[PDB]
Enzyme design. Structure first.
Site, PDB file in Angstrom:
ATOM      1  N   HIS A   1      -5.151   0.007 -50.964  1.00  0.00           N
ATOM      2  CA  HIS A   1      -5.055   1.439 -51.220  1.00  0.00           C
ATOM      3  C   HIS A   1      -3.817   1.771 -52.055  1.00  0.00           C
ATOM      4  O   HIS A   1      -2.798   2.137 -51.499  1.00  0.00           O
ATOM      5  CB  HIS A   1      -5.039   2.231 -49.912  1.00  0.00           C
ATOM      6  N   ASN A  29      -9.359   7.500 -59.060  1.00  0.00           N
ATOM      7  CA  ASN A  29      -9.040   8.884 -59.476  1.00  0.00           C
ATOM      8  C   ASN A  29      -8.052   8.817 -60.641  1.00  0.00           C
ATOM      9  O   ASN A  29      -7.056   9.534 -60.666  1.00  0.00           O
ATOM     10  CB  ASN A  29      -8.520   9.755 -58.330  1.00  0.00           C
ATOM     11  N   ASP A  88      -1.405   3.286 -49.373  1.00  0.00           N
ATOM     12  CA  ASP A  88      -1.767   4.515 -50.082  1.00  0.00           C
ATOM     13  C   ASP A  88      -0.573   4.901 -51.022  1.00  0.00           C
ATOM     14  O   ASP A  88      -0.111   6.042 -51.026  1.00  0.00           O
ATOM     15  CB  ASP A  88      -2.082   5.622 -49.044  1.00  0.00           C
ATOM     16  N   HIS A 133       4.150  10.473 -57.379  1.00  0.00           N
ATOM     17  CA  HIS A 133       4.214  11.914 -57.777  1.00  0.00           C
ATOM     18  C   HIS A 133       5.567  12.231 -58.441  1.00  0.00           C
ATOM     19  O   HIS A 133       6.602  11.596 -58.153  1.00  0.00           O
ATOM     20  CB  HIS A 133       3.950  12.854 -56.586  1.00  0.00           C
ATOM     21  N   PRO A 147       0.323  15.970 -50.996  1.00  0.00           N
ATOM     22  CA  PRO A 147       0.467  14.582 -51.466  1.00  0.00           C
ATOM     23  C   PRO A 147       1.420  13.699 -50.628  1.00  0.00           C
ATOM     24  O   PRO A 147       2.358  14.196 -49.976  1.00  0.00           O
ATOM     25  CB  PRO A 147       0.955  14.789 -52.910  1.00  0.00           C
ATOM     26  N   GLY A 148       1.147  12.391 -50.627  1.00  0.00           N
ATOM     27  CA  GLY A 148       1.958  11.422 -49.911  1.00  0.00           C
ATOM     28  C   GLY A 148       2.885  10.675 -50.856  1.00  0.00           C
ATOM     29  O   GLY A 148       3.408  11.254 -51.812  1.00  0.00           O
TER      30      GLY A 148
HETATM   31 ZN   LIG Z   1      -5.601   7.496 -51.929  1.00  0.00          ZN
END
Ligand SMILES: [Zn+2]
Length: 368
Positions: free
Chosen positions: A62, A96, A258, A262, A268-269
């Protein structure tokens, strides 16, 4: 050029094979030739792993590489750098991107960039729907031809639950897993996927779990023999209490960061590839899991989810080897940050446990 590497003097752990002990590893022609006490052969690089832990290359299923489309946040190169520095020899990238991974052209770009960077394996995923848009099922036969290892709509989730249903049908003839969730709805979505999973035969992998019910739900379907797996990001863990609990019972199959680069911030993480291990080692230090299980959740279980024969040190396998000192202190900051981004609550803390070497196909790709 020698064809031969010996990693002497470390504690080898390979949960896949029930192997644990003071062994040496002979590496020959990309691949693992022998594990035994006391090895010495002419014509080989020696690596002194005294004091360190030696185990299969970590796999992380991920990661958001942001490439193409948002390569100022991160890209295949800086992502791969992060990865190997964090002991990962395989990372699975999510679709994505822009344009999204829904045609062979994008798959093919990602594999090509990947071979050129040289550091870790990048395996593509495909979207579930054309342009992740929500309506039409994408071309699974061709994206899996091209090299995709899972399908997911990462950050739009199939609400149209009969779409999700067709996804699991086709996923099951092709023998690949469908990944879901990201961004009481969580519980309902997980029960839907489990229900839909058992009817279709397809494997569903749950990407976010946050409550004790959800874990119980997944655990229920798992004892019924439904092919449902789930992950937790080990940087998360510091009912958040029950997540720690579900790692204990073995309900959560693997760690996955994950990794989420950013640039603005104010789900968001967070970035994660370089800190996953010192993270996971915190659970070991407080005795929540053993070393075997922690290595298990970074190696063989993720391997099994995306159905690739990695995460072992079986004689034969590719010499994907991580070597770490679980006791060494270091700090993630500008000095050591290899991501293009900076977005994790761990920034400037003292972390404990640092990867010392990463070996992929028998070549060193990271050294401390
Ligand atoms: Zn993700």
């Amino acid at each position: 050029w020698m064809l031969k590497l010996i990693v002497k003097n470390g504690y080898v752990i390979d949960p896949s094979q029930n192997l644990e002990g003071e062994f040496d590893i002979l590496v020959e022609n990309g691949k693992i030739k022998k594990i035994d006490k006391n090895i010495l052969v002419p014509e080989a690089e020696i690596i002194d792993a005294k004091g360190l832990i030696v185990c299969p290359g970590f796999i992380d299923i991920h990661v958001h590489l942001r490439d193409p489309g948002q390569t100022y946040k991160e890209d295949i190169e800086s992502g791969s750098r992060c990865a190997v520095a964090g002991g990962f020899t395989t990372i699975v990238c999510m679709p994505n991107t822009n344009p999204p991974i829904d045609n062979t052209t994008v798959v093919n770009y990602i594999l090509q960039k990947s071979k050129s960077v040289g550091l870790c394996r990048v395996l593509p995923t495909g979207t579930i729907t054309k342009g992740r848009k929500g309506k039409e099922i994408a071309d699974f036969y061709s994206l899996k031809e091209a090299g995709c290892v899972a399908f997911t709509d990462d950050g739009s989730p199939v609400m149209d639950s009969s779409v999700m249903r067709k996804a699991l049908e086709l996923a099951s003839q092709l023998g690949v897993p469908i990944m879901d969730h990201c961004e009481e709805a969580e519980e309902i979505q997980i029960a839907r996927d489990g229900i839909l999973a058992q009817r279709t035969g397809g494997h569903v992998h749950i990407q976010h779990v946050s409550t004790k019910l959800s874990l119980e739900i997944i655990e229920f379907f798992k004892e019924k023999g439904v092919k449902i797996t789930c992950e937790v990001n080990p940087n998360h863990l510091l009912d958040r209490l029950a997540l720690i609990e579900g790692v204990k019972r073995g309900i959560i199959d693997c760690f996955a960061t994950d990794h989420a680069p950013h640039q603005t911030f104010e789900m968001p993480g967070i970035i994660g590839l370089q800190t996953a291990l010192p993270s996971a080692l915190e659970l070991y230090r407080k005795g929540i899991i053993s070393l075997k299980k922690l290595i298990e959740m970074f190696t063989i279980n993720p391997a099994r989810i995306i159905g690739v024969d990695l995460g072992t040190l079986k004689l034969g396998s590719p010499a994907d080897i991580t070597i770490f000192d679980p006791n060494k202190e270091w700090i993630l900051n500008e000095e050591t940050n290899l991501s293009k981004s900076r977005n994790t609550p761990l920034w400037g803390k003292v972390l404990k446990g640092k990867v010392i070497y990463t070996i992929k196909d028998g070549k060193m790709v990271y050294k401390d």
